[PDB]
């Protein structure tokens, strides 16, 4: 019985591979071969945010491109004013080993997650004026990898237990559970429509998930190591995934296959964070070589190099308006570029 | 500059002062990681060393030095990912029950994987061989011998500089020294002088566990100073 099922699964995989290969009429490197080059994009450190007592691991931009929240393993979440470089709020975390943070789109709540296996949502608009714990979302049998808010009431979380869940802050229960992956999920990526999201795990594959139906429709492969980062294209029809193989790949949801590959013989360090610009022309990705290289989304040419940090770049975030970019590292600094 | 901006800058300076004050407690507190298999008696040490849950924090103070010991909870066996967070720590407390001759190979493989990690290349490992009484009983009863698991036990000889304890038979001493040598064989591998293991013998009733960890942390800090302060 099981043998026939495995044979049928292998046949279906072969058919999917043949179908993806049949639709490969032309590669992206051939159509965009006549486009004008991007040149060299030089970025200088405009603001230098410091104050964290430990390594900075995660950061996220809210709706307003002026506010910024960063997560550090010291147990403190500081809201940074990118323009005045002033510390707005200080949230003393109960668990110091935090690994991710999220900023709600309304700007009223923020979430965090780490080895505590509990996603704690902090309310910033409390009438008492002090930041307190709103809800302690527990139930994940593993460390939390990444969290992202869909709206002011719903939030999706990822954990290393190979399972994802959709939480409701109103009641504090999992409304949808995803158990299709075969490895620890590392990062999430919400579409601009907030209706679909694709995530990557250590299984060297990324699967597109549905918020309502709660079922995976497409499975992307091609990586040779664990996928640590993932980011969706501004339009919402494609996404990129970073892995420790020092090779970033671009996947399209409509084509259901890879379109371009970003790699260089000089880069051998793994990828930690990947992000896109406002229009998606420039692809920024963080590497373990203490630098952050910018890649051309249409030509795969390195448009610049950011070597303003002295330690591993652990996170990367671009504002909603593309005015400035933030890069965090384990050296307890968070510098702003442009 | 408006008054609201000045008040915000004042609040930022107050937050910076609070962070500077918290630094005095963060940098002085030493963080330690507690690892071990399910059969390991690390729970007995945690319960006695008080001088869907995730990370478990255990704090104790000895000789005016605050120590923070963390134990992993429901996280899966996929260690290569979440182990990167516990880097830069003072030491990693590795407890293994040497009395279970069956699962010694798994413990040795885990110790080799931890010692040969890319990120823990500069982090020392404190080895504690817990449950020495059960090991003594098993090796003296003659029911299960170590030769049935390791073929080198029949060819190993007790070192000359081995100082046995009073009231202990030569067989128990030979067995424990063979285990210590088997562990040191993997500890010294790929050492490069950047991290050294500290084999130590302890038990569930041994109340001197806090002093051994204190001495190990002192030695590690001394070595780190000798390296950084240009003395090695």
């Amino acid at each position: 019985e099981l043998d026939q099922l495995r044979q049928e699964a292998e046949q279906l995989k072969n058919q999917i591979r043949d179908a993806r290969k049949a639709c490969a009429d032309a590669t992206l490197s051939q159509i965009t071969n006549n486009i004008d080059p991007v040149g060299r994009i030089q970025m200088r450190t405009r603001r230098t945010l410091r104050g964290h007592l430990a390594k900075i691991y995660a950061m996220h931009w809210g709706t307003d491109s002026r506010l910024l929240v960063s997560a550090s393993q010291d147990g403190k979440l500081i809201i940074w004013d990118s323009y005045t470089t002033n510390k707005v709020h200080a949230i003393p975390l109960r668990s110091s080993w935090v690994m991710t943070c999220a900023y709600a789109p309304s700007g009223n709540y923020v979430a965090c997650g780490g080895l505590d296996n509990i996603c704690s949502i902090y309310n910033l608009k409390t009438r008492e004026g002090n930041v307190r714990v709103s809800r302690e979302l527990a139930g994940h049998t593993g460390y939390l990898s990444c969290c992202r808010f869909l709206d002011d009431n719903q939030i999706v979380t990822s954990s290393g237990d190979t399972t994802c869940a959709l939480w409701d802050i109103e009641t504090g229960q999992q409304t949808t559970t995803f158990t299709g992956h075969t490895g620890d999920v590392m990062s999430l990526s919400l579409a601009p429509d907030t209706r679909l999201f694709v995530s990557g795990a250590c299984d060297a594959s990324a699967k597109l998930w549905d918020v309502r139906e709660g079922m995976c429709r497409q499975t992307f492969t091609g990586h040779e190591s664990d996928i640590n980062a993932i980011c969706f294209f501004p339009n919402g029809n494609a996404f990129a995934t970073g892995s420790d193989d020092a090779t970033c790949r671009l996947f399209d949801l409509r084509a259901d296959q890879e379109l371009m590959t970003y790699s260089h013989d000089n880069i051998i360090c793994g990828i930690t964070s990947v992000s896109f610009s406002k229009s998606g022309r420039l692809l920024l990705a963080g590497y373990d070589d203490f630098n952050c290289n910018v890649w051309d989304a249409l030509k795969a040419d390195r448009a610049g190099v950011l070597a303003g940090h002295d330690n591993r770049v652990s996170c990367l975030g671009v504002t909603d308006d593309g005015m400035a970019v933030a890069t965090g590292s384990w050296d307890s600094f968070l510098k702003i570029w442009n | 500059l408006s008054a609201e901006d000045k008040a915000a800058v004042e609040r930022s300076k107050m937050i910076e002062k609070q962070l500077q004050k918290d630094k005095q407690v963060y940098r002085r507190t030493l963080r330690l990681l507690l690892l071990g298999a399910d059969n390991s008696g690390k729970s007995t040490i945690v319960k006695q060393m008080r001088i869907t849950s995730g990370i478990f924090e255990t704090k104790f103070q000895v000789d005016k030095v605050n120590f923070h010991m963390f134990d992993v909870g429901a996280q899966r066996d996929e260690r290569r990912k979440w182990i990167q967070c516990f880097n830069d720590v003072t030491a990693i407390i590795f407890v293994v029950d040497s009395s279970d001759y069956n699962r010694l190979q798994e413990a040795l493989n885990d110790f080799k994987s931890i010692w040969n990690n890319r990120w823990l290349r500069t982090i020392s490992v404190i080895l504690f061989l817990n449950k020495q009484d059960l090991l003594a009983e098993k090796v003296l009863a003659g029911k299960s011998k170590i030769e049935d698991y390791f073929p080198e036990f029949a060819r190993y000889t007790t070192p000359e500089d081995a100082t046995p304890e009073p009231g202990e038979d030569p067989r128990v001493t030979r067995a424990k020294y063979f285990i210590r040598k088997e562990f040191v064989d993997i500890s010294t591998a790929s050492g490069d002088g950047r991290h050294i293991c500290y084999p130590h013998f302890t038990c569930s009733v041994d109340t001197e566990n806090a002093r051994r960890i204190f001495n190990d942390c002192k030695d590690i800090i001394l070595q780190m100073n000798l390296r950084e302060y240009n003395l090695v």
Epitope: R66, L67, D81, T84, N86, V88, H89, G107, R127, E128, G129, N130 | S2, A3, E4, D5, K6, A7, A8, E10, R11, M14
Partner: single-chain antibody
Framework: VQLVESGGGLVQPGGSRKLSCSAS????????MHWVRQAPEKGLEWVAY????????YYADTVKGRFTISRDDPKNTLFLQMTSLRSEDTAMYYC??????????????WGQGTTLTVSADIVMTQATSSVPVTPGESVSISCRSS???????????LYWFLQRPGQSPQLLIY??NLASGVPDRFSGSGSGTAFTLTISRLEAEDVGVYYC?????????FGAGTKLEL
């Protein structure tokens, strides 16, 4: 949040009296304290200001030197040592909390206040002192300032307060931005020198006096007050 002032009474001219306010239900250490007086049948006037941790203190030109402000964060109480009282210092003082950060709403809560029956500055002016209006009709209140409140950062430091008969002032607008708890019927818009407060639809509970205030500089100055008659 609740502020209960104490220490009021009949004091002869030249005496000494210390007002005490008890804070509870919020972080008294994080919020700054303000003292605003209200003479009988008159407008509001800023007295003094103290920041968090007693790091920044300011007094008005009419009370500088005589009165001193002090706070007790451990006990969560505010003190106002009022020395050398004058015959014109008779007024009801209100204790107001405030916090300063991006997106804050200073002067959000007004205490009950206590009465003390004794015995360049941006001067605000309102051309309309009393405007009798009918219920349901859209009311529009205009304000005028002598100095442009538009700072280089682009923020407009204008505050609107509504003090109903027998109640403490309530913050309506702190910067177009609507304060928490205030219905969406209120709306504010204007230029750097001209400001207008428009009400979408007046109700029976909207009666009272509207006081304007500028926060461009430390010496806060209030307006004359526009009262609406039902």
């Amino acid at each position: 949040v609740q502020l209960v002032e104490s220490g009021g009474g009949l004091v002869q001219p030249g005496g000494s009296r210390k007002l005490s306010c008890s804070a509870s239900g919020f972080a008294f250490s994080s919020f700054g304290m303000h003292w605003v007086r209200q003479a009988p049948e008159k407008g509001l006037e800023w007295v003094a200001y103290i920041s968090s941790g007693s790091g920044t203190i300011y007094y008005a030109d009419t009370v500088k030197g005589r009165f001193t402000i002090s706070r007790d964060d451990p006990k969560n109480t505010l003190f106002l040592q009022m020395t050398s009282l004058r015959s014109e210092d008779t007024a009801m003082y209100y204790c107001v909390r405030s916090i300063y950060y991006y997106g804050s709403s200073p002067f959000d809560f007004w205490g009950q206040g206590t009465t003390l029956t004794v015995s360049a500055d941006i001067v605000m002016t309102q051309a309309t002192s009393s405007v009798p209006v009918t219920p349901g009709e859209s009311v529009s209140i205009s304000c005028r300032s002598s100095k442009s409140l538009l700072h280089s950062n682009g923020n407009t430091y204008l505050y609107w307060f509504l003090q109903r008969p027998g109640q403490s002032p309530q913050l309506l607008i702190y910067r177009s931005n609507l304060a928490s708890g205030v219905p969406d019927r209120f709306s504010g818009s204007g230029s750097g020198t001209a400001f207008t407060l428009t009400i979408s639809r007046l109700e029976a509970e909207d009666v009272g006096v509207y006081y304007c205030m500028q926060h461009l500089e430390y010496p806060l100055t209030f307006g004359a007050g526009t009262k609406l008659e039902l």
